[PDB]
Amino acid sequence: LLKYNVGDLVWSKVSGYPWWPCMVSADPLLHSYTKLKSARQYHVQFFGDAPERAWIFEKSLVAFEGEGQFEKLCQESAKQATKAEKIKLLKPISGKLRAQWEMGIVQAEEAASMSVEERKAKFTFLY
Amino acid sequence: DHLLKYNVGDLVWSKVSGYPWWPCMVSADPLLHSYTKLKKSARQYHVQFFGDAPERAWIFEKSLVAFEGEGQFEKLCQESAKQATKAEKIKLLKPISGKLRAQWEMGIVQAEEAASMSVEERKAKFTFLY
Amino acid sequence: HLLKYNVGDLVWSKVSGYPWWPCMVSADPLLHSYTKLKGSARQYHVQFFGDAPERAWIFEKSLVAFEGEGQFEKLCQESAKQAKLLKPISGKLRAQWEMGIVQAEEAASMSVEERKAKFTFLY
Amino acid sequence: DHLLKYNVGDLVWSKVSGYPWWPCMVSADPLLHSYTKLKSARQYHVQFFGDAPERAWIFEKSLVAFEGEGQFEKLCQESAKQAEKPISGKLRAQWEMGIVQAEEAASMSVEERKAKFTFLY
Amino acid sequence: KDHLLKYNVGDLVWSKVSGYPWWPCMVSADPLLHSYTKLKSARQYHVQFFGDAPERAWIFEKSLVAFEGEGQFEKLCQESAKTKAEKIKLLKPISGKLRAQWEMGIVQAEEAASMSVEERKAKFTFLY
Amino acid sequence: LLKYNVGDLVWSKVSGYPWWPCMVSADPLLHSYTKLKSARQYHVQFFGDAPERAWIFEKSLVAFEGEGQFEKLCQESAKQTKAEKIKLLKPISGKLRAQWEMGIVQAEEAASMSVEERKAKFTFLY
Amino acid sequence: LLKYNVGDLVWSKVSGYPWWPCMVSADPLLHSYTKLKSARQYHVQFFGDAPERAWIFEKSLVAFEGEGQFEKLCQESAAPTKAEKIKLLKPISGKLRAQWEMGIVQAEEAASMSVEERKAKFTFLY
Amino acid sequence: KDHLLKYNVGDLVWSKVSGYPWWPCMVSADPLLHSYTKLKSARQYHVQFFGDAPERAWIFEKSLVAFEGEGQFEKLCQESAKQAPTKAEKIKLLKPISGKLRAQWEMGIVQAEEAASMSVEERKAKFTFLY
Ligand SMILES: O=C1COc2cc(C(=O)N(Cc3cccs3)C3CC3)ccc2N1
Ligand SMILES: O=C1COc2cc(C(=O)N(Cc3cccs3)C3CC3)ccc2N1
Ligand SMILES: O=C1COc2cc(C(=O)N(Cc3cccs3)C3CC3)ccc2N1
Numbered sequence A: 001l002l003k004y005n006v007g008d009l010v011w012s013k014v015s016g017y018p019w020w021p022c023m024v025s026a027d028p029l030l031h032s033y034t035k036l037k038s039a040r041q042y043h044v045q046f047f048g049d050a051p052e053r054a055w056i057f058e059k060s061l062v063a064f065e066g067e068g069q070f071e072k073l074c075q076e077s078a079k080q081a082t083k084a085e086k087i088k089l090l091k092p093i094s095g096k097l098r099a100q101w102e103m104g105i106v107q108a109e110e111a112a113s114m115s116v117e118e119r120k121a122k123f124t125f126l127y
Numbered sequence B: 001d002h003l004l005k006y007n008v009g010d011l012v013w014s015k016v017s018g019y020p021w022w023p024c025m026v027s028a029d030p031l032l033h034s035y036t037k038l039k040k041s042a043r044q045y046h047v048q049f050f051g052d053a054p055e056r057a058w059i060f061e062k063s064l065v066a067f068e069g070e071g072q073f074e075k076l077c078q079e080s081a082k083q084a085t086k087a088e089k090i091k092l093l094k095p096i097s098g099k100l101r102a103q104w105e106m107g108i109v110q111a112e113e114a115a116s117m118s119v120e121e122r123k124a125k126f127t128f129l130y
Numbered sequence C: 001h002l003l004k005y006n007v008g009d010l011v012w013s014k015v016s017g018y019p020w021w022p023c024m025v026s027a028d029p030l031l032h033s034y035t036k037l038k039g040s041a042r043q044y045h046v047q048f049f050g051d052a053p054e055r056a057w058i059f060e061k062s063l064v065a066f067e068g069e070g071q072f073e074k075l076c077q078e079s080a081k082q083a084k085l086l087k088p089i090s091g092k093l094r095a096q097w098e099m100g101i102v103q104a105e106e107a108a109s110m111s112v113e114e115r116k117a118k119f120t121f122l123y
Numbered sequence D: 001d002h003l004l005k006y007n008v009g010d011l012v013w014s015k016v017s018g019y020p021w022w023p024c025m026v027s028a029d030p031l032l033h034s035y036t037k038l039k040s041a042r043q044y045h046v047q048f049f050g051d052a053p054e055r056a057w058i059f060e061k062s063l064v065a066f067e068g069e070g071q072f073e074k075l076c077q078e079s080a081k082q083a084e085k086p087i088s089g090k091l092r093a094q095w096e097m098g099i100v101q102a103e104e105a106a107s108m109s110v111e112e113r114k115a116k117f118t119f120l121y
Numbered sequence E: 001k002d003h004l005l006k007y008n009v010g011d012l013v014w015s016k017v018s019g020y021p022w023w024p025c026m027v028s029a030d031p032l033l034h035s036y037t038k039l040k041s042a043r044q045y046h047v048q049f050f051g052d053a054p055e056r057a058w059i060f061e062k063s064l065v066a067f068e069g070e071g072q073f074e075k076l077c078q079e080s081a082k083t084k085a086e087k088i089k090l091l092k093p094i095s096g097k098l099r100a101q102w103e104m105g106i107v108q109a110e111e112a113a114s115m116s117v118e119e120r121k122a123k124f125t126f127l128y
Numbered sequence F: 001l002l003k004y005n006v007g008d009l010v011w012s013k014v015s016g017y018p019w020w021p022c023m024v025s026a027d028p029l030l031h032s033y034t035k036l037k038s039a040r041q042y043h044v045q046f047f048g049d050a051p052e053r054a055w056i057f058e059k060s061l062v063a064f065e066g067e068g069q070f071e072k073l074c075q076e077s078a079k080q081t082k083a084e085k086i087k088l089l090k091p092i093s094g095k096l097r098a099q100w101e102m103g104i105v106q107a108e109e110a111a112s113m114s115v116e117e118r119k120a121k122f123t124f125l126y
Numbered sequence G: 001l002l003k004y005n006v007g008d009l010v011w012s013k014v015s016g017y018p019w020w021p022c023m024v025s026a027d028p029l030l031h032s033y034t035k036l037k038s039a040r041q042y043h044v045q046f047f048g049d050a051p052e053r054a055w056i057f058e059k060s061l062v063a064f065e066g067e068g069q070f071e072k073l074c075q076e077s078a079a080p081t082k083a084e085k086i087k088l089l090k091p092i093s094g095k096l097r098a099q100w101e102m103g104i105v106q107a108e109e110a111a112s113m114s115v116e117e118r119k120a121k122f123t124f125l126y
Numbered sequence H: 001k002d003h004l005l006k007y008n009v010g011d012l013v014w015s016k017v018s019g020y021p022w023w024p025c026m027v028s029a030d031p032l033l034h035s036y037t038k039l040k041s042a043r044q045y046h047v048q049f050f051g052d053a054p055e056r057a058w059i060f061e062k063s064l065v066a067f068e069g070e071g072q073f074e075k076l077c078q079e080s081a082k083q084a085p086t087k088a089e090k091i092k093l094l095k096p097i098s099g100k101l102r103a104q105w106e107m108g109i110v111q112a113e114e115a116a117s118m119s120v121e122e123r124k125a126k127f128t129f130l131y
């Protein structure tokens, strides 16, 4: 009766980073995909050419449908945020990070076009 | 997926001609990314053979039996021998030796540890990287 | 423009003591060439499809363009007439041969560039 | 493939905002297995040459066919006029390493350079 | 004989590197030099930093504290804080990528602590 | 109170193979080095250029001191089936003789080291 | 008649970094260890827990004897620019100090070995 | 230091292992022990066997011959069969290699001949097998 399961596509918010396309996965060492810290976390892998992973709170996850959600996610996170935080959040990503974000989105949209089992077999990053 | 006999992470015994019934786990093809196919008229599942030197194959459902534990192996042998050629029966009942006996034993140890786990955890621990 | 095969082309290869095997023409990971002349008679570097991949320099005379599994029967009967060969493969080798066929038929359903990017075995 | 400006193995200079024009090679995505796509505007997948290789989907407008190092000065002066400094340290070394790899790759037939310089991922 | 040093291979410690928070670590052998401790008059131990992006270093014994759990971190910070700029920096709570990796390390160290030293060595020794 | 511990050098006997230079190690997956199958087993790594690993019974392990033990191990195993004895005393050849030799060279180099150092140098990665 | 050869231990200077313990090695892709750019360069590998590599000019290389040279290298490098001198003499800290220290430890162990043995142990795989 | 031995790291040799044909090899350091030669009264060298499935071994100097090219293989076989006092050993030695082993032997020769066309430093950097 949990909201997300292994293979589910999510957007994750990490402070200092834009909403990033992710996939819920098992921790390569701890072999769990969700845990309690009173507050639920899920283990995610960040999509793109330089993959990363983290334990992200459910409050910082939104179900991924496509790229078109990103604008609303920014404007909603800006309205919920400190005067300096809002001006920082609405600012568009550039350079290396813009390319990697774009690469992530391309991988996530390709993953979305697949059945959960097939995308787990293709897009689960090996560690 | 909820409609097939087996799913990714399920533990099965696989029979390959010339080999004993082997402890396996149903898994995604590392290249083709499918775990089952029709060869439609006959279903196959992609399995990984447990042990210190892992292998993988597409095995017909007719050659798969749900894994419960080591105690099933004797019945599987005696049933396969009764279903089998005069030379095939004498070969099937003969107990495994050397390198293959060790690797079979190692597989059994891995399968029994995998069986003591929830499907999600065993997929995350026992899925062999290729 | 004069070679019969190019990198990414799907072929059947015959190695003495083995059945006609589903392969793909590839570059040598060290020598970086896909074809050479042994001496008068052309060879191509191929990768044998399956769960346990291998590679070799095979003579053009031992290569046939891969269309699908349906060719295997004729390849056997033709090799037998030119010569054990007619006897069907079993055990581990039958499984690996089957796995190769499955990989080759998936590779055949793809554009040459995509199949090179997906099925070129890393060494 | 015979209809696009670039193909797998072609050497190009790539411009990424905040980075100098970089010696690259057109290649297939190691995951998606495509080398070009449309986003109305064509992109090509490239690998950045060097001792620490990277890769990206770059628009055709930000790619220039690589001939040699001698082009870099003009590319900078043209990119400055269209747009408010010479590279140093770690980045200067890695850029230099890319030039060395790209110029070696340019001295080879497309098939051989694909077999030698395609970065494994 | 190893039974004479304060720490041994597999022991869980907190390590302090200037500009970084007290980090959950395990004492391990150098993957190249194959030693876990050395003298520089002053003893050092080779450690691995726990997390999703593992690192390693030769850290002085003076900068190591035996790991019991996360609850020690607050005292370690307040004691390290007690240079004017260094104190204001030390007491400040970690954010972004580093906070996530620190959290991942703690999760790994607390799992490792729930194990016998032989098992934790076999599970948590990072390959190099 | 166990006879062997992680890093200990042993000779292992597997039916159809000569007594082989090994090291007691933790299973890369199960993370245990010993188990009870009433009869104790230890997880070992076979030394050589093509390393292998297995769960071997304590009855089939002998503490490794050096190569000089091999002759006695053969003659004792032979004394312990008529065909099995003639096979056991026969000296190894080809690929297997080379790999056995490579194992002994690695084991003797491992023996010249403190247990911690040999664990850090000779534990095969899986 | 080249000053350096594969396996030789040197100090390399890269702008914005302290003199770093290296070892001359062949380029893992281009298979050359030296080239001319007029001015000779050597391919070096930077010692440490996070190894790197580069083509460094001979003018920015000094034969490595030991850590004791570092102080003189700094004071000699300390640069017509007033800001450059104050930044060069300043001691390294944090992550970089640890990795520099790890490099020195590796270079001094490499120095205690014959060239062939150190090439077989310390050549970083790529 | 290493200027007095017959072979050095990077040198191309043919190696004879009982039950196998004379094989194209390169003298290399042991990936673990980091030595390329040792005494067992009799000198051995660490070699890597060329081919698509590389192997390595410590081979006695008596079983090594400096590699010049493929053309030497016939004489090496003829010399080996003449030195082999056993009647069965001679008939086995002169027999030509087949199947998988013939292909891998061929692949080794192709690699060794490429390696021979290079300076010792370059061939060490290109053909030293990673372990
Ligand atoms: O290709 C990629 C994918 O992953 C990235 C993560 C990051 C990245 O730094 N983060 C923050 C992290 C938290 C835990 C570890 S990483 C994520 C964006 C939120 C930066 C660039 C990346 N590039
Ligand atoms: O560690 C292990 C696990 O896998 C093995 C498979 C085999 C083994 O050969 N097989 C047959 C195969 C089918 C196709 C590829 S392999 C399986 C027993 C039925 C032998 C030894 C093994 N040792
Ligand atoms: O999955 C696979 C793919 O490759 C194989 C090759 C072989 C196999 O042994 N060969 C012969 C070879 C010649 C050169 C190297 S290998 C090829 C079939 C003709 C056996 C099993 C395999 N299984």
Ligand SMILES: O=C1COc2cc(C(=O)N(Cc3cccs3)C3CC3)ccc2N1
Residues within 6 Å of the ligand: A095, A096, A099, A100, D015, D016, D019, D020, D022, D048, D049, D050, D051, D052, D053, D054, D055, D056, D091, D094, D095, D097, D098
């Ligand atoms: O050796 C190398 C090669 O690649 C590099 C890329 C970069 C580098 O950061 N970039 C920007 C990127 C966009 C997408 C991913 S990386 C490229 C120069 C434009 C920096 C240093 C490198 N060093």
Ligand SMILES: O=C1COc2cc(C(=O)N(Cc3cccs3)C3CC3)ccc2N1
Residues within 6 Å of the ligand: E016, E017, E020, E021, E023, E049, E050, E051, E052, E053, E054, E055, E056, E057, E098, E101, E102, E104, E105, G049, G094, G095, G098, G099
């Ligand atoms: O997942 C992880 C684990 O290791 C890290 C180390 C560091 C990190 O940078 N350090 C400093 C180092 C000294 C020697 C090499 S690295 C350690 C915290 C003190 C940063 C992020 C990490 N993330």
Ligand SMILES: O=C1COc2cc(C(=O)N(Cc3cccs3)C3CC3)ccc2N1
Residues within 6 Å of the ligand: B052, B098, B099, B102, B103, F013, F014, F017, F018, F020, F046, F047, F048, F049, F050, F051, F052, F053, F054, F096, F099, F100, F102, F103
């Ligand atoms: O370099 C090496 C080291 O390991 C080997 C094991 C074997 C080898 O086959 N065995 C039997 C095995 C039991 C379990 C898995 S392997 C061991 C000798 C007893 C053969 C050759 C080897 N070569």
Ligand SMILES: O=C1COc2cc(C(=O)N(Cc3cccs3)C3CC3)ccc2N1
Residues within 6 Å of the ligand: D089, D090, D093, D094, G013, G014, G017, G018, G020, G046, G047, G048, G049, G050, G051, G052, G053, G054, G096, G099, G100, G102, G103
């Ligand atoms: O463990 C290590 C070893 O290598 C490093 C290089 C560097 C490092 O960044 N450099 C500069 C480089 C030039 C070419 C590529 S890298 C070298 C010190 C001069 C930083 C940290 C390192 N840590």
Ligand SMILES: O=C1COc2cc(C(=O)N(Cc3cccs3)C3CC3)ccc2N1
Residues within 6 Å of the ligand: F094, F095, F098, F099, H016, H017, H020, H021, H023, H049, H050, H051, H052, H053, H054, H055, H056, H057, H101, H104, H105, H107, H108
């Ligand atoms: O591609 C290759 C290269 O190496 C091989 C070695 C062997 C091979 O088995 N040997 C014997 C060995 C002794 C020590 C380890 S291996 C060598 C030929 C004499 C067989 C096939 C090979 N294929």
